[PDB]
Amino acid sequence: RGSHMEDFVRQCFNPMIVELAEKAMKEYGEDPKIETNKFAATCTHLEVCFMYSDGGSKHRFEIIEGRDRIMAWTVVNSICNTTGVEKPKFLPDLYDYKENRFIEIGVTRREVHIYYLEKANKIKSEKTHIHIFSFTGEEMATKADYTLDEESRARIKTRLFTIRQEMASRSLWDSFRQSE
Ligand SMILES: COc1cc(CCNC(=O)c2nc(-c3cccc(C(F)(F)F)c3)[nH]c(=O)c2O)ccn1
Ligand SMILES: [Mn+2]
Ligand SMILES: [Mn+2]
């Protein structure tokens, strides 16, 4: 209790995103009061996922991340049963109604190369698109198909570097980097 990471997450991120990240950690047996770095990562991942869905058209994306585990699996069943795409192994983040594929969003504190390899080895049915962002402004997507336009993607990298900057200004970034 009483971690600077917790008060920064509550001050930096959206109240709804903080609430959405708290439920996800509660449900998966984690405690944002103590597991404060994973609390900051869950909030960051949520925000990026929400800006990404805002980058396309109105009915472009279906948001999977940010729903309770049971409701998230229900909507992918409807997506699989009306489109014909195969059921993803683990839960993804989005679905592309324009490109007809699921999307896996990733935010990393390392080389964009390593994370995607990790995210690719657990989805052997490589039908799901994988998209990595980085806190240093680098990105990395499947088949070089970065899905969105450059302006929407650049907005994501800008916000990511602001979070890393605010984290470092409070001497929190060093603990956040050497923990992923
Ligand atoms: C906190 O609730 C959870 C939930 C799960 C299963 C569901 N998870 C996802 O869907 C997911 N998780 C991450 C992620 C972010 C930081 C650290 C880690 C890891 F260190 F645990 F690997 C993963 N990034 C994504 O992009 C992503 O989609 C697992 C654990 N905790
Ligand atoms: Mn997810
Ligand atoms: Mn993800």
Residue whose CA is closest, atom 2 of ligand 1? 25
Closest CA to 64 of 120, 24, 22, 14: 24
Q: Tell me how far apart the alpha carbons of residues 50 and 63 are, in angstroms, rounded to a whole number.
A: 8
Q: What is the resolution of this structure in A?
A: 2.5
Is ligand 1 within 6 A of the CB of residue 31?
no
User: Do the bridges between strand 61-63 and strand 94-96 make them parallel or antiparallel, or are there none, so unpaired?
Assistant: antiparallel
Strand order in the sheet with 139-141: 61-63, 94-96, 101-108, 129-134, 139-141
Do the beta carbons of residue 132 and residue 108 sit within 8 Å? yes
In the chain, the number of structural domains is 1
Range of the domain at 89: 1-180
Distance 28 CA to ligand 2 centre (A): 13
Is ligand 1 within 6 A of the CB of residue 45?
yes
For the chain, give the DSSP string.
Answer: ---HHHHHHHHHS-HHHHHHHHHHHHHTT--TTT-HHHHHHHHHHHHHHHHHHTTS-TTSEEE-TTS-HHHHHHHHHHHHHHH-PPPPSS--SEEETTTTEEEEEEEESS-HHHHHHHHHHT--STTSEEEEEETTS-EEEGGG---S-HHHHHHHHHHHHHHHHHHHHTT-HHHHHTT-
Do the beta carbons of residue 122 and residue 62 sit within 8 Å? no
119 is catalytic: yes
